[PDB]
A and B are shown apart, each in its own frame.
Chain A
Amino acid sequence: MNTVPFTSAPIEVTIGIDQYSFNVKENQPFHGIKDIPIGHVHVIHFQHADNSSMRYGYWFDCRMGNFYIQYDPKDGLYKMMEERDGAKFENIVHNFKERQMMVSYPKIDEDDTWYNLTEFVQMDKIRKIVRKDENQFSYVDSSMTTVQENELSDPAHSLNYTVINFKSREAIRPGHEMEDFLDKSYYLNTVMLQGIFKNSSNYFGELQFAFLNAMFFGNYGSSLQWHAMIELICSSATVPKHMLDKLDEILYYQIKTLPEQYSDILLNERVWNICLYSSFQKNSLHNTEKIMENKYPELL
């Protein structure tokens, strides 16, 4: 179990760690988060008490280095940094743990929620969507736009999700216009899966990463990407049976975890009604349809 120490907490802030969150008061004696489960990516995220504008945070994997947080009073935010000196880091953490200045990642043993939300998310793929190669961890915030959003403005700060556009030459074979527009299997299986993602695991990892950025930061282009990747599968008549079954599980845990009071903004009525009730795969998402119906029947 690994640790993300904090130098200090100089400004009052709500701190998120994965699906958990806690409030730290201004100059409260807080020095980080311990007992973070190894084997998954994680996200630590921030919303300042004084300015709820800009949720921001860092995707990281503790196996890839020793990371800590330190507030920067010039740029006004909590920054993740890597500590290259292994013994210094261990010594700092042990002191903070002895003085019990760290909260404990509060993972219930029965609870597979985080695993289920990040099953296919890899740091190496995150770092290609979020391009900042000098760091081993990836910064995301509320306001970052996607490559697709920028086409329709700073490239260094973009989310490089895979562009999906149903009315594009990539999506539509010359001479198969009606076929390919009404049944997106070509675009899903040949262009996207075989061509770009190489396999369903990479496709699902991006889908899960887009959802998590939508949920934790309110990142609108991430929400668009999540819905587009769902819709591309649901709108394909020919989808491997294992992908459909896994998709149902993936979405189930995403809908289960969504705050009840954010559903209005995070969920696209048209996509969901189409996917559950009108699409080729209308009958292939049993778990997701049951939780959606029992938890968000108004959207439908």
Chain B
Amino acid sequence: GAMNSSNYAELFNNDIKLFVDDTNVYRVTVHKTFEGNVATKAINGCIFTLNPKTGHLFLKIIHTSVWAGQKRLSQLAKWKTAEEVSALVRSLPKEEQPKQIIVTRKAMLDPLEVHMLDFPNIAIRPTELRLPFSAAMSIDKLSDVVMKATEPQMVLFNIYDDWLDRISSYTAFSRLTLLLRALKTNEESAKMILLSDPTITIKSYHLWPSFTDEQWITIESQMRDLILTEYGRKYNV
């Protein structure tokens, strides 16, 4: 059924699964028109499809042209997400196809179920976790590839960089969700933490900086402090 705190270790077992987050598929800026009415202008978006065990990120870029002439875009966006996830699954060899797909928002359940009727053995699950995957567009290289796209495009990343060489998936996912939660709560401060030291760089083929183990501990501590700080600033505690 639903994915929650009780069954958290299931994410790192050896059954292939994918998280799907649609929060950045349909993105707009709201502006005033010359006549003083309000209008939206869409910008490029992306589907965030992640294997939590391996780090493999299937970043499908949603180019603004897909919305041209379409109505009810926030509804269409869920069906387009479902269409693209189904197409990804069909594109994978059988032994790479997920056994479960977990959607971060319950409104994706029926669109994905309908698009996956051809795969009755793939379980479509909601989650009670508040995962911070919306903050994916706070990762500079991901934001950059989305905004520069001039056509629909799939881009592949490992969101864990090379961390699995040194740590388990459970710990890598914990690190990722802490980083993304911090980028979501105070992006400026989070990025200041990650880049403040000029000597630590990001490899060309990586998303995050090349921290040693001790430095990751320091970083992780700083990120927790940030989240607690923001929580105090927000709630006045």
Contacts and interface: CB of A to CB of B under 8 A. Distances in A.
A228 interface: no
Contacts, number: 23
A51 interface: no
A178 B82 CA distance: 10
B162 interface: no
Contact of A172 (B76, B83, B117): B117
Interface residues of B, number: 11
Contact of A181 (B76, B110, B118): B110
A63 interface: no
Nearest to A179: B79
A177 interface: yes
Nearest to B112: A177
Contacts of B83: 177
Contact of B79 (A168, A174, A178): A178
Q: Which residue, of A167, A169, A177, has the highest number of chain B Cβ atoms within 10 A? A: A177
B111 A169 contact: no
A183 to B, nearest CB: 12
A177 B78 CA distance: 12
Contacts of A174: 118
Contacts of B113: 167
B114 interface: yes
Contact of A169 (B79, B82, B117): B117
Most chain A Cβ neighbours within 10 Å, of B76, B82, B110, B117: B117
Contact of B82 (A167, A168, A177): A177
A281 B110 CA distance: 22
A168 B76 CA distance: 20
A168 B117 contact: yes
A172 B83 CA distance: 14
A207 to B, nearest CB: 25
Chain B residues touching A, majority SS: helix
Contacts of B117: 167-169, 172
Nearest to B82: A177
A66 to B, nearest CB: 50
B71 to A, nearest CB: 12
B111 A178 contact: yes
Interface string A142-176: 00000000000000000000000001110010100
B118 to A, nearest CB: 8
A167 B111 contact: no
Contacts of A172: 114, 117
B76 A178 contact: yes
B110 A167 contact: yes
B56 interface: no
A181 B110 CA distance: 9
A73 B216 CA distance: 82
B115 to A, nearest CB: 5
Nearest to A181: B114
A174 B114 CA distance: 10
A177 B86 CA distance: 11
A57 B85 CA distance: 51
A177 B85 CA distance: 13
Interface in B111-128: 111, 113-115, 117-118
B174 to A, nearest CB: 35
Contacts of A169: 117-118
Interface string A171-214: 01010011001000000000000000000000000000000000
Nearest to B86: A177
Interface string A27-47: 000000000000000000000
A177 B83 CA distance: 9
A168 B83 CA distance: 16
A165 to B, nearest CB: 10
Contacts of B79: 177-178
A152 to B, nearest CB: 13
A169 B115 CA distance: 10
A177 B115 CA distance: 6
Interface in B26-85: 76, 79, 82-83
B170 to A, nearest CB: 34
A174 B79 CA distance: 13
B215 to A, nearest CB: 47
23 contacts: A167-B110, A167-B113, A167-B114, A167-B117, A168-B117, A169-B117, A169-B118, A172-B114, A172-B117, A174-B118, A177-B79, A177-B82, A177-B83, A177-B111, A177-B114, A177-B115, A178-B76, A178-B79, A178-B111, A178-B114, A181-B110, A181-B111, A181-B114
Smallest CB-CB A-B distances: 10 pairs: A178-B79, A177-B114, A181-B114, A177-B115, A169-B117, A167-B113, A172-B114, A167-B114, A172-B117, A177-B79
Given A177-B83, A178-B79, 18 more contacts: A167-B110, A167-B114, A167-B117, A168-B117, A169-B117, A169-B118, A172-B114, A172-B117, A177-B79, A177-B82, A177-B111, A177-B114, A177-B115, A178-B76, A178-B114, A181-B110, A181-B111, A181-B114
